[PDB]
Amino acid sequence: MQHASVIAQFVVEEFLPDVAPADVDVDLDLVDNGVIDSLGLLKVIAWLEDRFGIAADDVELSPEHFRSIRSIDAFVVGATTPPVEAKLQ
Ligand SMILES: *P(=O)(O)OCC(C)(C)[C@H](O)C(=O)NCCC(=O)NCCS
């Protein structure tokens, strides 16, 4: 997991209902949340890339990458797993 709860909280915090992300089925395809795929993706890539100084072109953007939260956790875990107390930070 390497802070898997933070990953679900990170994306869920963008639009979490009155339920704590820990009580939300993080098994939901973020595709419905595709909202993050375009607007949030730009903000996430700019922030995520700034912390690791990774070129945005290095990674290709596609809806399949956000098909599920677990798929994103493996990609990030494969390279790095940074725990964050809140998405704002
Ligand atoms: P937004 O979230 O609507 O943008 C969709 C994303 C970022 C997933 C991307 O555009 C996409 O749909 N994947 C295919 C690649 C693509 O269409 N690039 C957009 C410029 S042609």
DSSP state of 7: H
Please tell me the experimental approach by which this structure was elucidated: NMR
- Provide the token pair at 11: 């994306």
Task: Among 30, 32, 61, name the best residue to mutate to test ligand 1's pocket (greatest count of ligand atoms within 8 A of Cβ).
Answer: 61
User: 62 CB under 6 A from ligand 1?
Assistant: yes
Query: Rounded to an integer, what distance in angstroms lies between the CA atom of residue 6 and that of residue 1?
Result: 10
Query: What residue has token string 């939260």?
Result: 69
Is the Cβ–Cβ distance between 39 and 10 less than 8 Å?
no
Residue nearest atom 3 of ligand 1, based on CA coordinates:
38
Q: DSSP label at 87?
A: T
